[PDB]
């Protein structure tokens, strides 16, 4: 939750002059409330867009368009405060629209968009756009929330975004398990561009059962910059046992972003 650029932004439109002023989610209307308030927004809607920084990197940006309700209280509206709330971490991120010029008519629809909130990949957020001034104590709400859900790093266009490139779904390790000698297996897989260790976890189960006869872990030291992207090969001696035919080998990476929680890859052999 942050706005990709500190660049200035535009909320003006044919008929309206306003500017966007960073705002804590506190407003001079919440305290020192004005007498006559405006009506809620209507048609709040949130889509998924992706924007570049000035540097190469690109993030998933939340695109908030809402329109202005068509009634008399428009006269008295003087801005709208947006609030993005990440549910996990109780993090709120506000900006605020401010109209230099009031508007007295509803001749055609007053639509607003704002897509400069950067968003995390698997995250659910609750965007909510209050109208300004804010309701007097014990008055009508005049805002409009809408839950928003960002798809995991498997989204066709998502996975190609910076936060998913780091700890990236772009890293696939061609995983090769060769039966080899009896009581011996040789696993190969290609590795990432980060000098952080890995871990293979070979567990073998009785066929048709979820108990494990044999389980062996193998630490792999942090790759040197020269070794990046070059398959690594580990030969492990399996348990000399009958019925211990079914083998699951999974690989866990520890990339800086997501360290320890990274997704793992399980290949399984059956006899």
């Amino acid at each position: 939750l942050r706005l990709l650029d500190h660049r200035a932004l535009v909320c003006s439109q044919p008929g309206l002059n306003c500017t966007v002023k960073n705002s804590t989610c506190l407003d001079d209307s919440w305290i020192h409330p004005r007498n006559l308030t405006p009506s809620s927004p209507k048609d709040l809607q949130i889509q998924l867009h992706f924007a570049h920084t000035q540097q190469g990197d690109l993030f998933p940006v939340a695109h908030i368009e809402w329109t202005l309700q068509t009634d008399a209280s428009i006269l008295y509206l003087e801005g709208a405060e947006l609030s993005v709330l990440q549910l996990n971490t109780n993090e709120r991120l506000c900006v605020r629209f401010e109209f230099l010029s009031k508007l007295r008519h509803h001749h055609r629809r007053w639509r607003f968009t704002f897509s400069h909130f950067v968003v995390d990949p698997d995250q659910e957020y609750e965007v909510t756009v209050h109208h300004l001034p804010k309701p007097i104590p014990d008055g009508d709400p005049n805002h409009q929330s809408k839950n928003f859900l960002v798809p995991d790093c498997e989204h066709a266009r998502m996975k190609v975004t910076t936060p998913c490139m780091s700890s990236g779904s772009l890293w696939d390790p061609n995983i090769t398990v060769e039966t080899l000698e009896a009581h011996q297996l040789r696993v190969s897989f290609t590795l990432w561009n980060e000098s952080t260790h890995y871990q293979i976890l070979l567990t073998s189960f009785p066929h048709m059962e979820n108990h494990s006869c044999f389980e062996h872990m193998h630490h792999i030291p942090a790759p040197r910059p020269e070794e990046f992207h070059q398959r690594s090969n580990v030969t492990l001696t399996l348990r000399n046992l009958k019925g211990c035919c079914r083998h699951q080998v999974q690989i866990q990476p520890f990339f800086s972003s997501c360290l320890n929680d990274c997704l793992r890859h399980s290949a399984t052999v059956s006899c």
Partner: protein, 104 residues
């Protein structure tokens, strides 16, 4: 007793949040409690989905319990009784999620 409307964060996360709500052995769901009289309006609260944690099979292990982890935070609550508007601080216990524990 004056509180500066100004606020600043040196605490920008710069890390990755994770969708562990449902991947937990003690899963929970979130609820956005909303009060127009306090700042911030929205405070997200979580409640445990089950009474016991959840095994690897998917079945609920009754023997170990799903329990709430709580955090102390401040919200400013504005009271308006009368013509006067006046707000004081407030310690509120947001439930952040749930963890799995061995009963005693």
């Amino acid at each position: 007793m004056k509180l500066d409307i100004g606020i600043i964060n040196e605490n920008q996360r710069v890390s990755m949040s994770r969708n562990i709500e449902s991947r937990s052995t003690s899963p929970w769901n979130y609820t956005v409690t909303w009060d127009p009289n306090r700042y911030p309006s929205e405070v997200v609260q979580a409640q445990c989905r089950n009474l016991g944690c959840i095994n690897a099979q998917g079945k609920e292990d009754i023997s170990m319990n799903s329990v709430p982890i709580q955090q102390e935070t401040l919200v400013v609550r504005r009271k308006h009784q009368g013509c006067s508007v006046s707000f004081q601080l407030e310690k509120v216990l947001v439930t952040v999620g749930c963890t799995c524990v061995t009963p005693v």
